[PDB]
Structure formats: structure tokens, C-alpha cells
Amino acid sequence: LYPKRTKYSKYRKGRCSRGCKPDGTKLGFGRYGIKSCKAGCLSYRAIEAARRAIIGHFHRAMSGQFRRNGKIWVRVFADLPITGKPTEVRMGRGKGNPTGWIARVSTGQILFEMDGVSLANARQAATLAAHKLCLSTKFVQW
Amino acid sequence: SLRRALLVAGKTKINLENCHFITGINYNGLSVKQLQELRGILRENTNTKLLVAKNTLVYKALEGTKWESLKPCMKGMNAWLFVQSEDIPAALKTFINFQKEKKLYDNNLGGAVFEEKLYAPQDYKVIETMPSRADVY
Amino acid sequence: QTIQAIPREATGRGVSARDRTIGRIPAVVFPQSLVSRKQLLTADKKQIKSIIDSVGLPFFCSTTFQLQIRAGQGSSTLVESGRVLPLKVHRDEETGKILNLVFVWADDGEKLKVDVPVVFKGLDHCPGLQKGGNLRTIRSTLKLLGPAEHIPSKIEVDVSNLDIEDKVLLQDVVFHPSLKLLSKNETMPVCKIVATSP
Amino acid sequence: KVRSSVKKMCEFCKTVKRRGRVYVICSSNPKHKQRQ
Amino acid sequence: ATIRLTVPAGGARPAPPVGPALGQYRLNLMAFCKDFNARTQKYKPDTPMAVTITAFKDNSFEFTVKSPTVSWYIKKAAGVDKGSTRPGHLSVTTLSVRHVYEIAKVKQTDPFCQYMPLESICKSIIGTANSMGIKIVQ
Amino acid sequence: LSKVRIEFNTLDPRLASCVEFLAQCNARKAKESNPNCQVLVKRRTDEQPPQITVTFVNGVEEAFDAAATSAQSIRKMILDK
RNA sequence: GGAGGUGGGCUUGGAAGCAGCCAUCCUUUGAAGAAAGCGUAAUAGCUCACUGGUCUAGCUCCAUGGCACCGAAAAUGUAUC
């Protein structure tokens, strides 16, 4: 969830894009998946929160998970260190102190991919991530 | 599906060829336990085959002949009985003690068929006694 | 499943835009040769969008297809026809719309490089499967050379004997002669199973 | 239970739009009452 | 109305649920206990049987003691009378063709099975077998 | 035994079937065989107005649908249930 | 009607469908899960998946989408055509 190892740091914010690489994607690693309809930004805590939601969901429905595992990939990783000044300070005199990473999310990336033996109880966890995430996603599959 | 209904019609028809006497009875209102008791007298004591089957489906089985006289007995809920050919009646007599006894079940009975002709309960003996079709005529 | 088409004389934005907006797909047939040369068509978007879902295979392009290429008026006029394979469907990211249909000719029986999936079948009974064995199906679809005539409809692998810690490589697939794999070395596993947690 | 977004819960609750805004009234339970 | 339980023959009725399990079917218990004592002396003792009582509204009910359960009969004829928690990994006995035949036939005369042949009630009772942990030889 | 509840409302498709139930095979002529029912005429609706129902001493409460059904069937299935 | 193995097996001072776990398997076979919800100190029961005729007719969900709706509270007086 963190580019913990040495990196240049203090990244230029950079404006968000109107599109992704143009070829209509396919799925990387699993049967069912989810994709971002609209670009934007997601914070590491947000993505990890969606992951908690999903893992804990299958864990809850251990009834469909007690077989073995219900494997899931999350394919977005925090990239840019979002920095910020304190709550009361004169503008300027430097840049913010790095206070949380962010991850550019384009118009077609696959956020979640997985093969939960039940299509029903996979589409059922589809809609259970856009609640805890910033953007509007879509239930896709292989 | 259609393939299921064709197979149900064919199996009912093959039973209709190897029997010699048929009884058609209204069986609405009746508990499952009573049906099991009826089957025991029907099969263990009289060797008979019972089927509840859809009226539209039964028409196609009787269409093969000779039970075309049983066409108007398929209005309302139908339970059919096919007795073995080497066996004469017995099941018809049982379906009567079993109808009369079981007033909580309100079975309206129906018309049975022997000699290829459906016969009235009062005329059951007269038709059975005369072997030829329209022998009295 | 004859697809219908009407030509177009177009390139990039400007015109394909109006085609899409009235409902029409800019598609291209061409022969396996070079410059590459066949007419430049438009399928009907209704025809194609319904067709990919109907097959139920997001790689439906595994199947040879047949084109009426109407040149004239009305519902059609019987004109030049096509026996072409779909080698590429450019599905839009945005929601699932369609942008481009790529058709290469194979009418002659000439060979092609095509896509076939590996649908898992024996999953009902398998010793590891009944220990619970689950897996990472490294390869779900592959590319096979071969003629136009005998083209398979798909490859339905036989995983019934996926031993507890064993795997179906590429060699074990039920090919046909002249459909030489030959484009991947058979040392690529197409599944496995492992006893992870009961 | 004035809600921004009602939710049918019991299989006998039904949605009714009247006087502009949608109620959801549940025959069985007097608890699954909602108003959007 | 009409219900079937699996009560034994020596004693009268299951003592703890004796009250409300049946006693709000308006059922008359005392003369029924006498009648069942009669049926048990008629039959032989010490075998858990299935009983298929039928009650009515006219303060008149009847009580059919047809036959014992063929599967518990299997358990009692073999020697292990248990219903295991894993019928698929814990098998209890080793049944044979002739004990299968005798058990099914003695139940064939009774109303327990509507099956007439031997192979069909054989399959019925080996279904009873594989429900719990029983391993038919052959 | 107990009570019949003939209801029938002259708005919906009217076939001679439910009027058969009203006039014959239920009314005074059939109350001759079912006299402990006090058959009368009711003039309101329940559901599919010719929805004729008969409620017995424990109430098998047997009932059949509207004009398009045969009257003979309503008679016999209210009397069987 | 939602059956009899069945009140399954286990727990349990009490569990039969429902404090609570295994089990989803037996068979009748018209139906039927080791009863869904509710509870009953267990009960029973419902009704539930799961029913025969009658219905007498175009019905139902899939999206391409279009314009609606709801969320949508400020200060002197409508006060965001």
C-alpha cells in the first residue's frame, strides 16, 4: 500500500487525464473484475478500505469461502505522495510535509479482479466497493 | 420441456396396451398418506398401476386407442388406474370402498372402461356380462 | 448467422463518428497478403453488439463468419460476399460499446493464427478438487495456427485427472494435425491445484 | 423514518409514490416504514 | 392428523415429550398404550419400530404398528446401532447379501415398502445404509 | 352444514355460467339437498366477482373463478371442498 | 399438503423447523429443507421453497438509451427566469 522504499518524493501533482490507453482492456488475472468508469484519484486508505470490505465479505460468507480461498487481486497501488501544509500557516515558505499517498485511476483500469466460486456472491460484492471508494466503477468479467 | 411430455405420453400409452381394464377417478382433496395406503391395496393385492397425469397429455395416450370413449372423463382432476390384462376388475371394486369410506376426501369418482366402451356404474354389470361391443343393441 | 454490411469511404474521426451516432460499426475486411487489400465496410452495430454477447465468449472471434456486403438499396441487394475470420474486436473502454471489427479472409482454406479458450470441464470430480484443491489457471486462452476449414469451435480441456499438485501443460491439449501449436513451447502450465486451507 | 434512500426489507413491503415523494409501506412489520 | 414416529415396543410412548408433541391432537393415550402393549405381545419385543398413528375429530383414533425401521434393524442385526457424524468417512458394519434379503423380505410383507421385487427394496435399504456408515459386502 | 357465499357483480364479462350457479344447482333446488346452509343472494364483490365460495363445518371452503369457467365445475368443487 | 428416515446426528436443565453446531444425505415418491421467517421453557402450527384442474391472454425481464423525480436548510422582504 506504500512505495516504502527510496523514491524521488515531493512529486509534481500533475493534472488528471481524460482517458486511458485506448485498447478496450481485458482482465489480468481472474474471472470477475471491476473497472473505473470515470478517472480521478483514490487514497491508499480508501483502496485498502475497499479491500477490507471484500476480504471480510468473503470471510463472512466463509460458507462460500470455507472451501479454500476465493482469490482476489487489487491492481492499483498508491503512487504520488499527497503533501499538505498545516491548518494555520502563511502560504509559501516551502512545500507540505508528505501526509498521504494517492493513485491515479484512469477511465478503464481494473481495480479489483478475483474468482469467487459464486458469480452471485461476486457481483454481490461488486456493489459493495463503490460505497467505500471515491469513484464510480463497473462490474466486468473475463 | 416438450421431450419430457412426449416420454410421459409414451410410457402411459405402453401401459395402456398391456392392461385390459381402466378406472378413472377424481383424486383432489386427498392426503399423501391415504394415497400410499391406496397403492398398497392396489399393487400388493391387485397388481395395478396408478398415475395422476395431465388431462391434455392423457388424451394423446388414449388417442392411440381403444380408450377414446374416456375423452369426456378428463374434465377436472384425474387419477388413472391400469390393472394387469390377466387380472379382471378388483381395483374397480376397491376404488369404491375407498371412495365411500373416505368422505373427508370428497372424491367424485368417474367412469371406468371395459370392452373399449366407458360404462355407467348402474350399467357396469350389464356391459361386463355381454362380451361383444353393442351386444345388447 | 450471416452478418450484413454496407461500405464506407472513411478514415479516422469525422465520419466514423456519424456512423456510430446513427448506429453503425466501421469494419474492415482484408486478405492475409500485402498492400493489404479488401473493401472497407460498415457492419451494423445492432448486428455486432448483439452477436458478441449471444456467443457468450468475449473471444467469439474464434469463429469464422460470413458476410453479405450489400451494395445498392433497400434491406439489401445480393452482392459480393465474404468468408472472413474475426481477428480483432476493438471494444470501447467507456461502457462496453464497440469501435472496430477486424476481418481477415480465410475463404480459401488458407491457414490463420487464431484464438481458442480452455474451458475447464472435469471440475466435477478431481482428487485435488475433492481435497478442495484450488488453483491459479495461468492460461485461459491461447493462439493456434491452422487452416480455415477444420477450425475448432473451442478447446474443452479434460481436467478430470488434475492430480493434487499436478498441472495440464500446453502439450496435453487435444489439438488436430496442421493446427501446430508451434507458437508457444508446451512448457507453459495451463492450470494446477494446491491444498491451501480446508 | 425519513430517509434519503428507502430500502425494502421485508418481502411484503411495497413502494408507493403519492403527493410527490415515495413512501415504502410494509404490511407485516410496522417498522419497515420509510419516506424518501 | 396422520404422523409416523420411531417409538419402541416394550414401553408405551416417549416419556419427556409425551404431553404436547401428540396431546394437542386430542389423542387418547391410555387405551392406546393398552392396545400397543397388545401389539407388542403379538409381535416380538426389543426392536425400535415405526408407528403411523391417525387421529380424527370424533374422539376416535387408530394406531398402526406396521414394521420396524429396516436401517436400525440393520444396526441391531449387525451389532453397531450408531448414527455417525461423518457417514462418508466412518463406516459402522459389514452387511451381507442374505441379511439384506431377510431384512427386506420381512419388511416386504409389512406396509413399510411399496416395492414388490427383491433388488428394489435391496437398493432402498442400501440407500438407508449409505445414508449412515454401512458397507455392503458385494 | 355451513354457508355458501355467492357474490357476483354485473360489471365484468358475464357468461351464463355464473348465472347457472345462481339459478340452478345452488339455489333453493340444491339447498333441498344442502338445507343447513341458508342460501340467499349477496350482491357485492370479493375478487373476480364470480368467485363463488362454500364454507363448511370445518370449512374445506371450496371456491371457483368467474364467468369463463363452467358452472357445473363450481357446483361440484364447492361441494367437494 | 410442504410428508414418513424425521423429533436426523450433536449440544442440551429443554431442540421436533426455527438458544445452538454437524448434516444436506434416506425413502414415500403429489409436494417437501434434515422445514425460511416467527416463536412455542421443547412443543404443535403456519407459510416458505416446493401445489392439479380453472384462469384466457399478450405477458416478463435485458439493455440502447431520452426527459422527469427524491436527496436539496439562513439569516430585513418573494430574493437563484
Separation between the CA of D10 and the C1’ of G37 (whole angstroms) = 10
- Asked whether the beta carbons of residue B106 and residue F80 sit closer than 8 angstroms, the reply is yes
Q: Which residues of F touch B (CB under 8 A)?
A: 60, 73, 76-77, 79-81
- CA dihedral (A72, A73, A74, A78) positive or negative: positive
- Residue A95 — φ and ψ, nearest 5°? -120, 165
Helices (H) and strands (E) in chain F, counts: 3, 2
Q: Is the CB of C95 under 7 A from strand G?
A: yes
Separation between the CA of B58 and the C1’ of G30 (whole angstroms) = 17
Q: How was this structure determined?
A: cryo-EM
Which residue is it, cell 474468482? Answer: A115
Q: Is the CB of E17 under 7 A from strand G?
A: yes
Contacts of B29 in chain F (CB under 8 A): 60, 80-81
Resolution of the determined structure in angstroms stands at 3.9
- Asked whether the beta carbons of residue E1 and residue B39 sit closer than 8 angstroms, the reply is no
Separation between the CA of B34 and the C1’ of G5 (whole angstroms) = 19
Residues with Cβ < 8 Å from C110, sequence gap 6 or more?
C32, C147, C148
Q: Is the CB of E79 under 7 A from strand G?
A: no
Separation between the CA of E25 and the C1’ of G35 (whole angstroms) = 20
- Asked whether the beta carbons of residue B31 and residue E54 sit closer than 8 angstroms, the reply is no
Beta bridge partners of B118: B113
- Out of C58, C94, C198, closest to residue A142 by CB: C58
- Asked whether the beta carbons of residue C92 and residue A24 sit closer than 8 angstroms, the reply is yes
Q: What is the three-class DSSP state of E51? A: strand
| DSSP structural state of residue E89 | T
Q: Is the CB of E23 under 7 A from strand G?
A: no
Q: Is the CB of B54 under 7 A from strand G?
A: yes
Nearest in space to E88 (alpha carbons), one of E134, E126, E136, E127 = E134
Grid cell of A141 as nine digits: 468479467
Contacts of B25 in chain F (CB under 8 A): none
Grid cell of A138 as nine digits: 463497473
Nearest in space to C136 (alpha carbons), one of C98, C85, C191, C188 = C191
Q: Is the CB of E15 under 7 A from strand G?
A: no
Question: How many CB atoms within 10 Å of residue F7?
Answer: 17
Residues with Cβ < 8 Å from B112, sequence gap 6 or more?
B21, B22, B23, B24, B92, B118, B119, B124
Contacts of F81 in chain B (CB under 8 A): 28-29, 106
Residues with Cβ < 8 Å from A98, sequence gap 6 or more?
A9, A10, A81, A82, A83
- CA dihedral (E44, E47, E53, E59) positive or negative: positive
Give the Cα separation of B127 and E31 in Å (integer).
Answer: 49
Give the Cα separation of B121 and F73 in Å (integer).
Answer: 21
Give the Cα separation of C54 and C174 in Å (integer).
Answer: 26
CA E130 to chain centre: 17
State the number of CA atoms in the 13 A half-sphere of F67 facing the CB. 11
Contacts of E111 in chain B (CB under 8 A): 37, 40
Q: What is the three-class DSSP state of C54? A: helix
- D with B: 3 or more CB pairs under 8 Å? no
Q: Is the peptide bond before E34 cis (omega within 30 degrees of 0)?
A: no
Contacts of B26 in chain F (CB under 8 A): 80
Name the CA radius of gyration of chain A, rounded. Answer: 17
Give the Cα separation of A105 and A139 in Å (integer).
Answer: 16
Contact A83, A10 (CB under 8 A): yes
Closest nucleotide to B56's CA, by C1' atom?
G53
Q: Is the CB of E86 under 7 A from strand G?
A: yes
Q: Is E110 exposed, middle or buried (0-12, 13-18, 19+ CB in 10 A)?
A: middle
Contacts of C93 in chain A (CB under 8 A): 19-20, 22, 24-25, 35, 107-108
Query: Min CA distance, B92 vs chain E (Å)?
Result: 20
Give the Cα separation of E4 and E64 in Å (integer).
Answer: 9
Nearest in space to F62 (alpha carbons), one of F74, F45, F46 = F74
Contacts of C140 in chain A (CB under 8 A): 142
Separation between the CA of C76 and the C1’ of G47 (whole angstroms) = 59
Query: Min CA distance, B136 vs chain F (Å)?
Result: 32
CA C166 to chain centre: 29
Beta bridge partners of C4: C68
Contact A40, A105 (CB under 8 A): yes
Query: Min CA distance, B37 vs chain E (Å)?
Result: 8
Element (H, E) at E95: strand E93-95
Separation between the CA of E18 and the C1’ of G61 (whole angstroms) = 53
CA C99 to chain centre: 16
Q: Is B95 exposed, middle or buried (0-12, 13-18, 19+ CB in 10 A)?
A: buried
Q: Is the CB of E108 under 7 A from strand G?
A: no
Name the E strands within chain C: 3-7, 25-30, 40-43, 65-68, 81-91, 98-105, 112-119, 141-146, 155-156
Nucleotides of G under 7 A from a protein CB: 1, 3-10, 14-16, 22-32, 34, 42-45, 52-56, 64-65, 69-72
Grid cell of C135 as nine digits: 488453483
Question: How many CB atoms within 10 Å of residue C46?
Answer: 12
Q: Is E44 exposed, middle or buried (0-12, 13-18, 19+ CB in 10 A)?
A: exposed
Cα→Cα distances C138→A92, B56, C170, F16, Å: 52, 54, 11, 72
Q: Which residues of D4-36 are buried (b: 16+ CB within 10 A; e: fewer)?
A: eebeeeeeebeeeeeeeeeebebeeeeebebee
The nearest alpha carbon in chain F to B77 belongs to F77
Query: Min CA distance, B108 vs chain F (Å)?
Result: 8
Q: Which single residue has its CA nearest the C1' atom of nucleotide G72? A: D4
